[PDB]
C-alpha cells in the first residue's frame, strides 16, 4: 500500500498514476485533497 | 432569516421589531468573472 523509493501506481477514486513516494515539505490545508507542481503535475497526495 | 432574544412569535408582526444592539449586513451578487491568484513559497493565497 504505502511504499517509498519504489515507484508504483496509485488509484484514489481514479487518479491512477506512476510515482516514487518521498517525505515532503508540503503543508496541506486540512480541506485539500492534493497538490501540484509547475505546469499542473501531481506533486503530492494525502491518504484519505 | 432573523430572530431576537425574548421575541414573541405571532401570525402577524408589526414593523417596530425588537430592541437590540447595532449591527450591519451586506449583500452582493456573484457573476462569472476571471481571477489571477498568486501563491507564495509557503503555499497560501496572497494577492487576487
Amino acid at each position: 500500500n504505502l511504499v517509498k523509493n519504489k515507484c508504483v501506481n496509485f488509484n484514489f477514486n481514479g487518479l491512477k498514476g506512476t510515482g516514487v513516494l518521498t517525505e515532503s515539505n508540503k503543508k496541506f490545508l486540512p480541506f485539500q485533497q492534493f497538490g501540484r507542481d509547475i505546469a499542473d503535475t501531481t506533486d503530492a497526495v494525502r491518504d484519505p | 432569516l432573523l430572530a431576537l432574544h425574548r421575541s414573541y412569535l405571532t401570525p402577524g408582526d408589526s414593523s417596530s421589531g425588537w430592541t437590540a444592539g447595532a449591527a450591519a449586513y451586506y449583500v452582493g451578487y456573484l457573476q462569472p468573472r476571471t481571477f489571477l491568484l498568486k501563491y507564495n513559497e509557503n503555499g497560501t493565497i496572497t494577492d487576487a
Partner: peptide, 17 residues
C-alpha cells in the same frame, strides 16, 4: 447607504495546495 466592496469574497475554486 452605498459602499464600494473591496477585495472580499475570494475563495479557493479547486482546493489544491
Amino acid at each position: 447607504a452605498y459602499t464600494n466592496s473591496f477585495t472580499r469574497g475570494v475563495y479557493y475554486p479547486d482546493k489544491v495546495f
